Design a protein around this ligand. Structure first.
Ligand code: ADP
Length: 381
């Protein structure tokens, strides 16, 4: 039957399908083409995607996310132990050193492996595709980070099987993005491709070489805790200090609701500032019946996050340095990840590459799913 490509992302997931001999990226029921990689369990239901993410504050112990940071890893891994201190859900050690997520669900304690959480997300991507295409779907390519090891790959395949998918192949995220732009069929001889992938919570840079249409991952670098959320945090912080300055030292972070509402509008302000030079936050009855409003300029946003945005160019230097390649030798710079929409981030990268135009014609948070789907179709016939 038909085959699909799924980007199983750390914070968002995305699915591509084949209609009329081209690739369609599938909207979810919110009209969005990316679905949060969130699941939640209550006494009467389980929620996936936006619904799960939206109720996190009301049910934080049973709202699971970041499963991609556990999948295929061991419980006493240092990264795992570090991440566990920032998650409100419980993780305990299963037999054979396997992490187990423990939550409450339908009135009982329930245990899940990370691949079981990821299977739910994959099942959602499968369902929305089935509605979109009007048929049952089994065959899929699923993407993973280039640095994922054999155990992380197999656990991703298992998440596939658990969701009822026949995973024809697990391919690398940066390669899928390269495939989406046809880069393996563009020009003569050897082609050097840099993938710059800045998301909600992770940053990955990958340097690939293509020859005779064959992909080799030459070098990877990045930061697994830099992305869009950190930029949101900086906007929040600014607003908190502005509010004190206006209201005799009153701190808004003391109230939870005021923070959620503020964090919600900061995210929206950040998005708005990718296409406008000004954004407004205005929230009635924010803290102590105190109303709050502020005008935030793009320049101010760029200023609050200046260190972060400069820090994204260091992994670009590391992959090039590690591969013994000059930045001049890169033929395609590909922007992937929703945070690449930030004009300043695009300007920094373009400046680093001496004014070269990036490949950005495909939505950067859809490029991976797109390439996955091309590959699914090739493997499918
Ligand atoms: N227009 C925009 N301007 C700035 N940031 C954006 C915009 N659209 C999406 N983002 C950011 O993209 C991030 C999600 O990226 P995505 O690539 O979907 O995540 P993942 O890393 O899981 O693949 C979020 O932080 C979101 O705020």
């Amino acid at each position: 039957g038909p085959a699909i490509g799924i980007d199983l992302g750390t914070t968002y997931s995305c699915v591509g399908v084949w209609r009329n001999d081209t690739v369609d990226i599938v909207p979810n029921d919110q009209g969005n083409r990316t679905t949060p990689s969130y699941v939640a369990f209550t006494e009467t239901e389980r929620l996936i995607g936006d619904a799960a993410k939206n109720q996190v504050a009301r049910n934080p112990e049973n709202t699971v996310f970041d499963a991609k940071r556990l999948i295929g890893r061991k419980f006493d891994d240092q990264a795992v132990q570090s991440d566990m201190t920032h998650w409100p859900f419980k993780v305990v050690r299963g037999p054979k050193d396997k992490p187990i997520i423990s939550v409450n669900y339908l009135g009982e304690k329930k245990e899940f492996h990370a691949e079981e959480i990821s299977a739910m997300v994959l099942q959602k991507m499968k369902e929305i595709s089935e509605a979109y295409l009007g048929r049952q779907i089994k065959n899929a390519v699923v993407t993973v980070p280039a640095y994922f090891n054999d155990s992380q790959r197999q656990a991703t395949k298992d998440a596939g099987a658990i969701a009822g998918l026949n995973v024809m192949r697990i391919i690398n995220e940066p390669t899928a993005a390269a495939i989406a732009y046809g880069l393996d069929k563009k020009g003569t001889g050897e082609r050097n491709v840099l993938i710059f992938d800045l998301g909600g919570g992770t940053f990955d840079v990958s340097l690939l070489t293509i020859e005779d249409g064959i992909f080799e991952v030459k070098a990877t670098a990045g930061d697994t805790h830099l992305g869009g959320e950190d930029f949101d945090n900086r906007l929040v912080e600014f607003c908190v200090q502005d509010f004190k300055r206006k209201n005799r030292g009153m701190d808004l972070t003391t109230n939870a609701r005021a923070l959620r509402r503020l964090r919600t509008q900061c995210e929206r302000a950040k998005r708005t500032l990718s296409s406008s030079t000004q954004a407004t936050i205005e929230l009635d009855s924010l803290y102590e019946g105190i109303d709050y409003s502020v005008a935030i300029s793009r320049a101010r946003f760029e200023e609050l996050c200046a260190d972060y945005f400069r820090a994204t160019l260091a992994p670009v230097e590391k992959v090039l340095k590690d591969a013994g390649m000059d930045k001049r030798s890169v033929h395609d710079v590909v922007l992937v990840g929703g945070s690449t929409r930030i004009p300043k981030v695009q300007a920094l990268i373009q400046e680093f590459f001496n004014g070269k135009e990036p490949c950005k014609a495909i939505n950067p948070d859809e490029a991976v799913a797109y390439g996955a789907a091309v590959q699914a179709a090739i493997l499918n016939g």
